[PDB]
Symmetry: D2
Subunit: 268 residues, 4 copies
């Protein structure tokens, strides 16, 4: 009798247990969903993390830059869930930008090969993921991507901002294409979440002045947010993704839902 | 064991059973909610309508232009549900614009007294409703208003578009004020819904060319919408409102969720 | 041989020489324009101010809440400039919100009569000004309003933010109606400008903490702005308004041009 | 005594005399500007087109995908205008997407190498162009890019929409970086312009149904536009770019100005 009871959902993007996708996975299972997970590169590390989830789930290798991985993905998912079953949700929780395109490096100093890799992984793969999973998706199903509001420029985020702007545009076209199968596509735009990478920045991995500066951008996010914002708590985000994966927003597609405490809606 | 299990929700705006709020009410009860209804003016007609809902609920009179009605609302809800029980959600489903400000009358020809009445009922009252209900709202509660995407000008809607632009602005401030009580505020932007008033326009009550033109605007909304749009089916909208009333979007506030088939995200 | 050479332009909203419209007027005359000025209430104070402009211009009384003033405006401009000469531009530089709706008063505590007066003067009057002036406007003419970016809620501005959200909506409809006469309509969204009223706030007329807070909001606007922002310098805003009055943006209408140093495009 | 009198302006993007950059060049020279042109690939064809301009101008080869071309660009511009002179404007009028990413090809069927080439040329090069010309730009100077409103998905434009969404994001970061030199950056979002490529589509180069369909998207653009839209007339666009290159919008940066007849501001 759970929100996602009986739903079969692909969840990409787990690498640690601070991963947003880890908590999407956890909440989805606690809501009654059966999952199929995917991981990139460190497959053994990903299996160990995934065993900490409430329930076991099949894990599949997927490098979104790998054409062969994508071509076979739907075949491998179907064997996972059964030749006759189909997915009801797909969670895109994948991002990447080399340190030349995001960090202390000047914005003009990022070579395009690096930016191009970052946009491939972070934006284009939303479309290629949808292309690879839509043939085995049910009608009324739901594809959800993870966003960080790129409406305005900001320090450090740099070319990852540009990738997110691209991802928002891709989402609207995925919505169009998925719509013919009866499948919705949306993004969830989250506030900052303290992953292990994000702590490293507080710890100084890009400079000590930055750790303070970001620690104060986070305090400013909490100040702007009318209901506050706790960056150590990804659970609100995970619940929002499950909201989109459920049957309760059945006419919403091509859009961005903000799970950020309202901070985007307040000037200061 | 439902989405709004045990939640208490004020629902405003029922006048017919084609009313959007009627279907919000019906879906919310089927999802486990217990309601307090409000109605305006034709109180006996509204009780007749309310008797057709899945479950009984108290009906309170509320003219949002009436300061006395508003001042006493929290006390009268309290007497209905008990001065120890609190509200979990509030649904604003109220709009009005005189015929001078919306329809076939030239845009420049609407007198301000008419526009001001329209904006009072349609936008300001989202703030005065929230002010009158927040004292008896629980933490984590949810306030929801009905919107019609006014980002772009359009024929006929005229000053109601301006009232909706005003309402979107009010919602962000309500979000700020409600946030201190741990209460979220959002709007749902619905596509066209065939109410009795809307059928009158197709039936010609504003010119025969407009009924055709209207009938073709609806077919183009269904064409733009990647997953389609059925204007005779308010249920998708009602479900989305309940999605926002639930506990599954706990970090979302001050925003607009589009329940329009995705039509606003597609140019053509 | 200047930007507005030979153009005739109504300029509203002069009350002091710190008024934005005073600098619009001064720049427009230096660019070659010939003006008709309007003023409200303190007519003798405004003539004293108008005498300080580079060139003489007629002053007409205009209370935008006064239907008689508006009905006669085109005739009175005609008598000023000649019933065979037409206007080339109209500058709306008018705003007002009672202290209950903007400042230190709680957002929920503004009575609607006060909000309605504020929206009448600040937003509706952009439509009624345009309706009263278009009969005597030339093809290719330009109507320009002053805006303050209300996309996001913010402290103090409160119901004036809502009036500005309303004004942006009105501008798109004015654009539609003016378009049949070959007349453009746009808004300029300016950053904070130090008027006499604005200095009063820094000087403490709404609390000492607010003056500091205000003084720091201005320093953060200058920090966000990639090219900086000098709130003691209205000249950039006046130039932008003239840019829109000229013939160099002949396909731009219904939009908002940001004269804010770029601060609205940067998150921090 | 022209709008751009004495200004030195780099203009990229001429390939035919229907090129938007051709008309930007023409209007700029007619406004009193001295130019430096750049061309890609068919250098001899570009020289012949450029000789039809009102005044001669130095032409320089520039392939924005060519690191050596970019590194030397400022050296070659300086030799062109004089070792001691500097640019006052830079016009980015460059776009490209392979036929896999824009046209009749399904959206999901575009390989990333093609999308990546299109985003390199169409979006990233706005940043690399600015990086290569800013060292020789004066304070108060202006960089202008050409945009096509990608806020909503649309048929055919497909991955070029995504590139434009990326370009809008890049523009805001270029505004940030250029701001430290005192240089503004903006985009002009134009309505459809009948280039030779665009006529080919009307002529059937991608299918006859499309030629009618686009011919009717253009008639719909003219209908939405409150002041109309003439796609055979790029002069309004060119004038708008010159508006941004002038001294008259000196506090505008990071933004998009719409030269589209107002069509983006109207729903229908
Ligand atoms: N952390 C935040 O504050 C925050 C805020 C808003 C949005 N987001 C977004 O949420 C998503 C998840 O990021 P996160 O913060 O959980 O960090 P994360 O490092 O835990 O997750 C990113 C994931 O991307 C995967 N990935 C990278 N390259 C890949 C490839 N070639 N193929 C397949 N997978 C690949 C990694 O394996 C990893 O699991 C990203 O899209 C990110 O942009 C994060
Ligand atoms: N019908 C649509 O196509 C559509 C689309 C999008 C949004 N909406 C919005 O949905 C909401 C509900 O409208 P609807 O379409 O269900 O029509 P409706 O006529 O059924 O509901 C509007 C309600 O507002 C009430 N109301 C009017 N004046 C009032 C006052 N002074 N005090 C209190 N209540 C008052 C009426 O009694 C009525 O119940 C409105 O806000 C409307 O703008 C409607
Ligand atoms: N000052 C800023 O920081 C700032 C920033 C952005 C936008 N703006 C806008 O610029 C415009 C000009 O304001 P300002 O800052 O120059 O202040 P101001 O006080 O100098 O100008 C406002 C004008 O509105 C006039 N006005 C008020 N009620 C009127 C009525 N009933 N009829 C006619 N005119 C009436 C006043 O006489 C005054 O001349 C306003 O629309 C304001 O909201 C101001
Ligand atoms: N034509 C329209 O309807 C329209 C509408 C809005 C925006 N725009 C934009 O206006 C700009 C100009 O396009 P146009 O319509 O004038 O067409 P066009 O073909 O005349 O111009 C595009 C230019 O890009 C250049 N280019 C391509 N690859 C290049 C590279 N590697 N290095 C350098 N230059 C390269 C070509 O040489 C050409 O001059 C583009 O950015 C386009 O997206 C066009
Ligand atoms: C300094 C800065 C603006 C603070 C907020 C964070 C939020 C954030 C977004 C984001 O997309 C990511 C991310 C990017 C790529 C791969 C994995 C994760 C992140 O770590 N953090 C981005 C950086
Ligand atoms: C011609 C037009 C654009 C067709 C679509 C409709 C949608 C719509 C919105 C709306 O707010 C209402 C509405 C307004 C006031 C009170 C009750 C309902 C409506 O009836 N219809 C609005 C008019
Ligand atoms: C605290 C706050 C955000 C600082 C910036 C200012 C900018 C501003 C806008 C504005 O519309 C006005 C204004 C309003 C009504 C009449 C005349 C002028 C203003 O004074 N100041 C608005 C208030
Ligand atoms: C069918 C469609 C939406 C009609 C409108 C046009 C407008 C348009 C934009 C545009 O960026 C271009 C373009 C793209 C790449 C290189 C050169 C030019 C174009 O030709 N035409 C784009 C295609
Ligand atoms: Cl590969
Ligand atoms: Cl009353
Ligand atoms: Cl009156
Ligand atoms: Cl190279
Ligand atoms: Na806060
Ligand atoms: Na459709
Ligand atoms: Na700055
Ligand atoms: Na038209």
């Amino acid at each position: 009798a759970g929100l996602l009871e009986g739903k079969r959902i692909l969840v990409t993007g787990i690498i640690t247990d601070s991963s947003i996708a880890f908590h999407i996975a956890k909440v989805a299972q606690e809501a009654g969903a059966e999952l199929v997970l995917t991981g990139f590169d460190r497959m053994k590390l990903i299996q160990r993390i995934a065993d900490r989830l409430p329930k076991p789930a099949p894990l599949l290798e997927l490098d979104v830059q790998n054409e062969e991985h994508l071509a076979s993905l739907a075949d491998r998912i179907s064997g996972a869930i059964g030749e006759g079953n189909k997915l009801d949700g797909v969670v895109h929780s994948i991002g990447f930008m080399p340190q030349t395109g995001m960090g202390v490096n000047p914005f003009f100093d990022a070579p395009y090969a690096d930016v191009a890799k970052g946009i491939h992984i972070s934006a284009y793969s939303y479309a290629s993921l949808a292309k690879a999973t839509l043939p085995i998706m049910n009608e009324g199903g739901s594809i959800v991507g993870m966003d960080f509001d790129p409406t305005r420029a900001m320090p450090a985020y740099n070319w990852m901002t540009v990738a997110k702007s691209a991802l928002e545009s891709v989402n609207r076209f995925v919505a169009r294409e998925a719509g013919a199968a009866g499948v919705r596509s949306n993004l969830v735009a989250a506030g900052p979440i303290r992953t292990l990478a994000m702590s490293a920045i507080v710890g100084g991995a890009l400079g000590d002045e930055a750790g303070k500066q970001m620690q104060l951008l986070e305090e400013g996010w909490d100040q702007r947010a009318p209901i506050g914002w706790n960056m150590k708590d990804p659970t609100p985000v995970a619940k929002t993704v499950c909201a989109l994966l459920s049957d309760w927003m059945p006419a919403t597609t091509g859009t961005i839902i903000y799970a950020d405490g309202g901070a985007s809606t307040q000037l200061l």
